[PDB]
């Protein structure tokens, strides 16, 4: 399973949430924001790294990020 | 005369040359007619060969043992037109280019969007500039002295 | 079941067809795993015993046959080798077979036993007996 | 929001295909999605061709979360209907999956939990060198 | 002598064919 | 009803449009802020189904450029006439076809490039040309130069009128979406009107100016001596003396005892023998024949009367055992979309390329065509690059139309859903047959050199040792070889002299044509065949079916028909659109028409061409070692590689020295290709930022930030290097051995 | 071929071939016991590169030694 | 008038008009001087 960190310069566009194919991230309330929301990844053993999340994410680095990991069935995207 | 060379009008392979190039012409020439236009489009290549091995006789290069010039690039006065004048008007042709395109640059920069100016060019600024770059040289050194030339 | 990754065509399911591999030694689940490989040896060494005789380096002498038979014994010892790994790989000593337990119809039936360490080290004595039989009867046959 | 159930619903007409299930789906475990829709329409599976849902309650079996996922937001973005899949394991247990909260990821919702934040800038990470001879990383600091 | 006509055989086909299946072995091995 | 719809001044004439760059899209419209904007306003200027959605302004741009592509091809026909009518030796190489090499270039005298003026002939010097277009223009009866001066004229008169017309239909006068979604009158106009009416007439045109020219020609007449073509017409009294059955007029036509006119309507076959190549009388009872069936077979379709066919109602009520109802909505989805009907017309263009070219090479059809070997040559492996490039593009186009213009809810056609419901079959299949094939066919290669490498030449797959022989062609070439003794009582001789059997045809002590044997060798290259067109096949069909979605990506419609990839997740998804696998199927159609035009070549300078002494002895170029030495890898590097190389590396100070400079220069863009073909855009980007700081030090930083190109424009670059340079060395290659040798 | 084709066509290749011998009689009673799965990125990379590098020696040791032994001079 | 110059002056066009020009002044200044290896003026 790989490994999905959000960090607290995101401002609550919720893009990340929407591009994710396998439902893996949602959003939360917060307090340090105009939006009052920050992401959660949960559902981290869904992850299969298609990096979507990072391609809809506007900052001038990521506040979201994923890093590669240990491979299982579910992140390898196999059906047989 | 330097590095055991020998100068191109006293070699013999310089003149074998020129006989093989010749005799291969002619054997070219032999085939049409003498009122022909190839005959004397084959007769004018023959002269220009002539002329050609003249000139670099004259010139003074040095052919090796092979029969061929040799270019001396050390700075010895005797070999200064091989390639150090050459040298000096390319490198004055290219200081003409950069400052020009420089200039240009930094005339377009003021603008609010130079990339509509680049992908399309302005003829009458550019042709005012064109001619700042016959005095690029003193330019340059006026704007090191100062100290326009390098950005902070 | 539309929702499952096979197709019904009248090839692979056709009464001939499935007669004819239901009566196959490789699909009878009663019968105990040996007397299938002795079968299925015969017929596999009595089919591989031409090739090497026919093609072999030694053809066009008189020594070739014989020279060729013995090729095809060794064929079937180093097949027998790559059964046995197999098993030992797959199949542990105490786990129940791992076969289909229902039928297409949906009756229970008994699992096949073939998929057992006991079963695969039965069908591979019995391949390698009747593989070196049936190649021992071929070269008979072919040269007396 | 409390998991419902999925006991006897019917499935689309279909006429069957290659890109269905396989071995895994006995072995490991498959998934399941379930909607409601208001009129008998043709909509394109997943694992290619075309089928018929009918009116009312509809469920299907497929073999990853992604297919499942990418059906369900066509249907959510297309015919503007609601879903919901389950996930299913060979010992027989059944699993919610979708909106667990029951509202969908994308709108805020009190009461959840937040995993995998860290408070700081993606530059004030240590390098790899202070993480060294341990079994921990950067990143997870 | 004629230690080629033994020893060529042995490292060509028998060792290779023993270490394959002990490697298969233990790798296939939980 | 069938009727003229138009619309008036649908757009206004400015320029005003031409000022901004990238009018078509707003994207491209609105500026460029970086470098690849310019990389983008090329790529998507023609792309007319993305610049808007109405089905008219697609249809009338693309009648548009249909008229200026017209417009183009009328001015390269006449800028070709123009430089054979002046700056030629036609009429020197008229009276001496056999001993003149053709040449319609000069070069001028500027650097010292006058040496690529050879002696070609006939007292003339330039470049030997090897369009055969000189074979055309003696076939059609041109004996002067003023001819081509004023055939020049008209094709520039034609051109400017192509221009005129598409300028007048976009901009004046516009047909609407009714007028093209009529496809039954376009269908009767193409049959029977552009292609039925052309060929009769320029069937007229070889009864009435061709044949008498080119039989006084063949007489031995001079060609200032012959009458001027005007004057077989005005003059029937000439005609008489040539042919008597033109005194009897045109009443035996109507009188239907049409057998008077057998002396220029024939139907013997064979080549003629004093030009080596088809009779014209063939010829022109050929196109006859073709005008009527034409004339008759385009009346069949419905158009604004009662009589005739529905091409709905003949797809809808057709019935089979196989098919069933089957196409149903197809003539829908066929009118609605141009990109299936592209893709269609393409891969039919290729299939007619190909024949086309293998027909021209078996039969020569114009005079003293087979004994000049360049042109063939050329002719042959030209043809076969066209065709397969077209061949290739069919299958993009066909990807293109499943991915953007298919929806099984407006327009669902059963065949292509029962076709998409068990795509795994087929790829499983094909992918076996592939490697059965490769396996058998590389494997008896590496089998023959591996025996010959260890002294066993009695092991190997060879006319000697172990042979296998092509039994079903030698069956069908002794079949055709008998055919006109009792199968075809009407014809003298066999069509062609290639079917093993007959008597061989040599033109001016040089070799025409002769029975062409069968071996082992032909099994085994043909087998190659196979397997290489079976690969590209499989790779062209797996990027069609799984266009729309995959097992490992569900939902890859929406991507698009061009992404990269879809990330670093699922173990890596690189290549995975349509557009990869079209970039990957272009190297397997490079390798395997490189393999047949090899093949083609080493067999015709082995086995056919060569010249005969007074005795009767015929000299092959290379001595018939195609049998023997083309059974193995070394022997095909050795024989072929190594030794027809000679001449082009030699060809250094003569007039072929051009070619040998290309030799090397296709290598270099060669190699060049491989930068990007090994690489990515990280490393680029990243050297590009230290360039960009080296720049901003000395205040010359652009305004448009310099950028990589993408992935995508990258793969391009690398595979138009990688085939431009391949293409280049065999031209090259080719092209100086078969002018230096032949 | 490890240097220009890249994962996805293999990959989806590889699937069909899994459910090709999943489907078949008589050799579906084997089954593997490691899912099959086309090589990685870096991998490749490397296959690539050994093959270059050994095709690269091979040849030029090849042509070396044949034809400075072949004229001995 | 105001576009067609416009869209004269684009990169493409200037850029063809002007190595059109160059190229025709090398060549020119090759034919009325041959050949040239050194710089014999001085
Ligand atoms: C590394 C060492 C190696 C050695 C020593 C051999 C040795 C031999 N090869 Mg093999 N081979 C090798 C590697 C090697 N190979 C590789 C890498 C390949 C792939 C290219 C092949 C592919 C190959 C082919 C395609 C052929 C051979 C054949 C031969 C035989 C040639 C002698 C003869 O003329 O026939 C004398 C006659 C014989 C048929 C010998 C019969 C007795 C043999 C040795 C069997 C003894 C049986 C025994 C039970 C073997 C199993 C035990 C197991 C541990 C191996 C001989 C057994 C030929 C052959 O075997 O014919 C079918 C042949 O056609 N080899
Ligand atoms: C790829 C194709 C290929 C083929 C067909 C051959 C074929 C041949 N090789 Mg060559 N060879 C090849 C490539 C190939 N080679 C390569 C790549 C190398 C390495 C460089 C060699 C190196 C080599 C050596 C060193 C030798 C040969 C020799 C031979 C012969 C030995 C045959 C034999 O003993 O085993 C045949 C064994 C079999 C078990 C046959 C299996 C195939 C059966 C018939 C399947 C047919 C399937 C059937 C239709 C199924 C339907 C089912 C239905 C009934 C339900 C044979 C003519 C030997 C020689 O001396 O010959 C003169 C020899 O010594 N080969
Ligand atoms: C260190 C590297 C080395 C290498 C690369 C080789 C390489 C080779 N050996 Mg030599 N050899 C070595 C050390 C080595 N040897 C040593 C230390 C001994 C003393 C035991 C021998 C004794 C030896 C014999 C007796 C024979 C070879 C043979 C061979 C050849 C075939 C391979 C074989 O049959 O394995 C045989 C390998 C060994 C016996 C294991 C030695 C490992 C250590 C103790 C090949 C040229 C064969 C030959 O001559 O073919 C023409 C053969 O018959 N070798
Ligand atoms: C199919 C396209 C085509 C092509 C590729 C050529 C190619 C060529 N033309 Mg031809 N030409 C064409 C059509 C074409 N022509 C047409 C339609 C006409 C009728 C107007 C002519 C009339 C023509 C003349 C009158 C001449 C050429 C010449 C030339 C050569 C030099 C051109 C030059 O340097 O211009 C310089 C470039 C610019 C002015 C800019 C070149 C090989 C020249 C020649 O070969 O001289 C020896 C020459 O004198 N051409
Ligand atoms: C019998 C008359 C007729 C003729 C001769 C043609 C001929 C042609 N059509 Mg077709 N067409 C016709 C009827 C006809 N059409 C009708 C009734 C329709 C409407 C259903 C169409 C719809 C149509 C479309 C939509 C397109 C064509 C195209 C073409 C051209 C194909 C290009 C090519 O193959 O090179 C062959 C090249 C030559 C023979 C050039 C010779 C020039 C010809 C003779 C011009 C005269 C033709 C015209 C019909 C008559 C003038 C009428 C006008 C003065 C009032 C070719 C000029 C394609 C094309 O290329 O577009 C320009 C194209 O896109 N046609
Ligand atoms: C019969 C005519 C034909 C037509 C009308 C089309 C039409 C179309 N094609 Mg298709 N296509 C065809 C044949 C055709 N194609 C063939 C034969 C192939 C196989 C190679 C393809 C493969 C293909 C691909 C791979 C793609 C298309 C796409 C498109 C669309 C975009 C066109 C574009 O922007 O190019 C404008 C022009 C260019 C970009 C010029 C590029 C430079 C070329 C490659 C250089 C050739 C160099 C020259 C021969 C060598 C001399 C060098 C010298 C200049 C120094 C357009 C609708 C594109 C699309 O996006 O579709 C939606 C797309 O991605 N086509
Ligand atoms: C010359 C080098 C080369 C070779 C040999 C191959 C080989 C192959 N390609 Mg690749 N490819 C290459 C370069 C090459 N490619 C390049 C430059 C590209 C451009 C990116 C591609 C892109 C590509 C695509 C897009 C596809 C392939 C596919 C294939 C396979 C075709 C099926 C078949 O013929 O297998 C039969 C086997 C052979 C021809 C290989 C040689 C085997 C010989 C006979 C030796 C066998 C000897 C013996 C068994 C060895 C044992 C010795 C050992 C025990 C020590 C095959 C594995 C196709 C595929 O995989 O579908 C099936 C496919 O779709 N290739
Ligand atoms: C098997 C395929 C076959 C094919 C493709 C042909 C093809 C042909 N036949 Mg032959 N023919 C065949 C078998 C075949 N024949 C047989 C079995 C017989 C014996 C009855 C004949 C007897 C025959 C006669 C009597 C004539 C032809 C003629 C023709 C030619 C003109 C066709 C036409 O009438 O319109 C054409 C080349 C005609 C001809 O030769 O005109 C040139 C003609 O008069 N054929
Ligand atoms: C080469 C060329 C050219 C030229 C061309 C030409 C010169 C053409 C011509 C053409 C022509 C010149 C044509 C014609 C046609 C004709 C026709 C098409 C006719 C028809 C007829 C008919 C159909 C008839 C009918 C009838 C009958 C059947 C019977 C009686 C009655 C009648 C008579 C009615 C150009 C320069 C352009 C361009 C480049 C190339
Ligand atoms: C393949 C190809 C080619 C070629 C082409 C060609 C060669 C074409 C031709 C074409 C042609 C050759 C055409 C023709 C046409 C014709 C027509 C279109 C006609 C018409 C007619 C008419 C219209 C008539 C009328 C009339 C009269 C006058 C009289 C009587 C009555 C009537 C009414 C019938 C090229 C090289 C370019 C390249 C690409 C491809
Ligand atoms: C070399 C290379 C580059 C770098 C290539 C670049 C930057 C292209 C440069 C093209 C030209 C030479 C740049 C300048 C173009 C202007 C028209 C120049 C105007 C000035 C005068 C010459 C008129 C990539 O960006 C790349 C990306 C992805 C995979 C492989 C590669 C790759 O191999």
Redesign the pocket.
């Known amino acids: 399973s790989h490994s999905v960190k959000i960090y607290d310069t995101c401002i609550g566009c919720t893009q990340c949430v929407r591009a994710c194919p396998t439902d893996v991230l949602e959003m939360i309330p917060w307090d340090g924001c105009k939006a009052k929301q920050i992401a959660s990844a949960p559902r981290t053993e869904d992850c299969v790294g298609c990096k979507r999340c990072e391609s809809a994410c506007p900052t001038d680095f990521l506040s979201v990020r994923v890093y590669l990991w240990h491979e299982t069935t579910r992140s390898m995207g196999l059906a047989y | 005369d330097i590095s055991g060379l020998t100068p191109c009008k006293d070699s013999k392979q310089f003149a074998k040359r020129e006989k093989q190039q010749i005799k291969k012409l002619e054997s070219s020439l032999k085939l049409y007619a003498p009122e022909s236009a190839p005959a004397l489009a084959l007769n004018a290549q023959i002269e220009k060969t002539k002329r050609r091995f003249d000139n670099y006789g004259k010139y003074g290069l040095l052919c090796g043992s092979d029969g061929l010039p040799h270019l001396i690039v050390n700075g010895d006065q005797r070999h200064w037109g091989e390639f150090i004048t050459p040298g000096i008007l390319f490198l004055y042709i290219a200081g003409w280019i950069g400052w020009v395109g420089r200039s240009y640059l930094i005339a377009i920069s003021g603008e609010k969007k130079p990339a509509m100016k680049e992908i399309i060019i302005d003829v009458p600024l550019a042709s005012r500039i064109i001619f700042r770059g016959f005095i690029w040289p003193v330019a340059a050194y006026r704007e090191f002295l100062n100290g326009d030339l390098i950005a902070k | 079941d539309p929702f499952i990754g096979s197709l019904e065509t009248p090839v692979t399911s056709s009464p001939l067809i499935a007669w004819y591999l239901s009566n196959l030694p490789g699909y009878r689940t009663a019968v105990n795993p040996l007397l299938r490989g002795v079968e299925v040896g015969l017929a596999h060494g009595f089919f591989l015993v031409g090739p090497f005789v026919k093609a072999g380096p030694l053809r066009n002498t008189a020594y070739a046959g014989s020279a060729g038979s013995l090729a095809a014994a060794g064929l079937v010892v180093i097949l027998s080798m790559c059964l046995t790994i197999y098993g030992i790989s797959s199949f542990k000593e105490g786990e129940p077979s791992i076969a289909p337990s229902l039928t297409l119809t949906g009756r229970k039936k008994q699992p096949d036993q073939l998929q057992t360490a006991d079963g695969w080290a039965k069908f591979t004595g019995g391949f390698f007996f009747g593989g070196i039989s049936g190649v021992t009867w071929a070269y008979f046959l072919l040269y007396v | 929001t409390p998991p419902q159930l999925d006991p006897n619903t019917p499935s689309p007409i279909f006429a069957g295909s290659t890109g269905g299930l396989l071995r895994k789906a006995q072995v490991e475990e498959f998934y399941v999605i379930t909607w409601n829709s208001p009129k008998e329409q043709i909509f394109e599976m997943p694992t290619g061709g075309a089928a018929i849902m009918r009116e009312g309650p509809n469920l299907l079996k497929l073999a990853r979360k992604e297919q499942c996922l990418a059906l369900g937001t066509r249907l959510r973005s297309k015919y503007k209907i609601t879903y919901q899949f389950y996930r299913v394991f060979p010992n027989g247990e059944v699993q919610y999956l979708h909106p667990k909260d029951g509202v969908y990821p994308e709108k805020a919702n009190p009461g959840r939990e937040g995993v995998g934040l860290n408070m700081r800038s993606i530059g004030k990470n240590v390098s790899p060198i202070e993480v060294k001879f341990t079994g921990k990383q950067s990143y997870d600091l | 002598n004629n230690l080629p006509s033994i020893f060529v055989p042995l490292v060509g086909l028998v060792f290779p064919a023993i270490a394959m299946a002990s490697l298969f072995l233990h790798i296939q091995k939980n | 009803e069938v009727k003229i719809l138009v619309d008036r001044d649908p757009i206004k004439t400015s320029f005003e449009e031409w000022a901004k760059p990238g009018h078509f899209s707003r994207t491209i419209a609105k500026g460029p802020d970086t470098?690849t904007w310019?990389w983008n306003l090329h790529a998507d200027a023609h792309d007319f189904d993305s610049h808007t959605s109405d089905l008219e302004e697609i249809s009338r741009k693309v009648f548009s450029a249909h008229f200026g592509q017209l417009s183009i091809i009328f001015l390269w026909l006449s800028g070709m006439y123009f430089h054979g009518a002046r700056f030629s030796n036609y009429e020197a190489w008229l009276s001496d076809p056999t001993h003149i090499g053709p040449s319609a270039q000069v070069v001028w005298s500027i650097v010292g490039q006058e040496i690529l003026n050879g002696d070609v002939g006939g007292g003339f010097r330039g470049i030997q040309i090897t369009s055969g277009f000189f074979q055309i223009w003696r076939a059609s009866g041109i004996t002067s130069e003023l001819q081509l001066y004023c055939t020049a004229i008209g094709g520039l008169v034609f051109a400017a009128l192509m221009l005129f017309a598409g300028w007048f239909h976009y901009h004046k006068a516009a047909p609407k979406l009714a007028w093209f979604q009529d496809v039954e009158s376009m269908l009767n106009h193409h049959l029977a009107g552009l292609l039925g009416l052309g060929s009769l007439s320029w069937a007229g045109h070889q009864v009435h100016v061709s044949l008498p020219i080119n039989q006084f020609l063949n007489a031995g007449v001079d060609p200032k001596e012959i009458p001027l073509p005007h004057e077989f017409i005005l003059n029937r009294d000439l005609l008489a003396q040539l042919y008597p059955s033109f005194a009897e007029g045109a009443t035996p036509f109507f009188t239907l005892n049409w057998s008077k006119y057998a002396e220029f309507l024939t139907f013997r076959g064979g080549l003629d023998p004093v030009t080596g190549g088809l009779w014209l009388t063939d010829i022109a009872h050929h196109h006859l024949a073709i005008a009527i069936l034409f004339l008759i077979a385009g009346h069949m379709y419905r158009t604004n009367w009662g009589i005739g066919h529905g091409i709905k109602d003949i797809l809808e009520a057709h019935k089979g055992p196989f098919t069933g109802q089957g196409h149903k909505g197809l003539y829908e989805i066929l009118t609605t979309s141009w990109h299936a009907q592209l893709s269609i017309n393409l891969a039919m263009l290729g299939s007619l390329t190909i024949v086309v070219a293998h027909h021209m090479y078996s039969m020569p059809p114009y005079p003293y065509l087979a004994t000049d070997y360049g042109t063939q040559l050329s002719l042959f492996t030209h043809h076969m690059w066209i065709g397969g490039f077209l061949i290739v593009g069919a299958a993009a186009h066909a990807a293109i139309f499943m991915v953007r213009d298919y929806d099984p809810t407006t327009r669902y056609n059963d065949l292509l859903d029962r076709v998409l419901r068990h795509r795994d079959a087929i790829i499983s299949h094909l992918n076996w047959v592939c490697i059965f094939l490769g396996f058998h066919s590389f494997g008896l290669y590496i089998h023959n050199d591996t025996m010959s490498a260890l002294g066993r030449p009695q092991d190997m797959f060879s006319d000697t040792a172990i042979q296998l022989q092509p039994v079903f062609a030698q069956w069908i070439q002794n079949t055709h070889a008998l055919a006109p003794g009792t199968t075809a009582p009407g014809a003298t001789t066999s069509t062609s002299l290639t079917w093993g059997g007959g008597d061989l045809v040599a033109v001016g002590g040089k070799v025409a044509l002769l029975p062409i044997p069968l071996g082992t060798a032909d099994f085994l290259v043909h087998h190659i065949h196979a397997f290489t067109i079976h690969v590209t096949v499989l790779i062209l069909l797996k990027g069609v079916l799984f266009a729309r979605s995959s097992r490992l990506i569900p939902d890859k419609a929406n991507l698009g028909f061009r992404f990269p990839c879809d990330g670093p997740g699922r173990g890596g998804t690189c290549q995975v659109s349509a557009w990869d696998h079209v970039f990957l199927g272009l190297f397997w159609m490079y390798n395997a028409i490189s393999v047949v035009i090899f093949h083609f070549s080493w067999k015709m300078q082995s086995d056919v061409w060569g010249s005969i002494s007074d005795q009767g002895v015929v000299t092959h170029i290379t001595g018939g070692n195609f049998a023997q030495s083309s059974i193995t890898i070394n022997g095909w590097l050795r024989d072929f590689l190594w030794a027809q190389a000679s001449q082009v590396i030699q060809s250094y100070g003569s007039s072929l020295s051009a070619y040998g400079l290309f030799f090397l220069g296709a290598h270099f863009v060669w190699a060049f290709s491989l930068?990007?073909?090994?690489?990515?855009?990280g490393y680029?980007?990243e050297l590009?930022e230290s360039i960009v700081w080296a720049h901003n030090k000395l205040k010359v930083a652009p305004a448009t930030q310099?950028?990589?190109?993408?992935?995508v424009?990258?793969?391009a670059?690398?595979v138009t290097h990688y085939l431009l340079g391949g293409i280049a060395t065999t031209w090259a290659f080719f092209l100086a051995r078969i002018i230096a040798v032949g | 071929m490890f240097l220009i084709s890249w994962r996805g066509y293999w990959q989806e290749l590889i699937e069909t071939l899994a459910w090709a011998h999943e489907r078949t009689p008589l050799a579906n009673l084997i089954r593997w016991r490691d899912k099959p799965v086309a090589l990685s990125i870096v991998q490749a990379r490397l296959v690539g590169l050994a093959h270059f590098s050994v095709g690269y020696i091979f040849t030029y040791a090849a042509f070396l030694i044949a034809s400075t032994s072949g004229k001995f001079g | 008038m105001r576009d067609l110059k416009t869209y004269l002056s684009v990169?493409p066009v200037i850029?063809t008009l002007w190595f059109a020009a160059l190229a025709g002044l090398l060549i020119e200044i090759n034919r009325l001087f041959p050949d040239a290896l050194i710089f014999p003026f001085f």
């Open positions: 470098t310019i930068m990007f073909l090994f690489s990515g855009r680029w980007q590009i310099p950028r990589a190109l993408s992935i424009q990258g793969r670059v690398g | 990169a850029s």
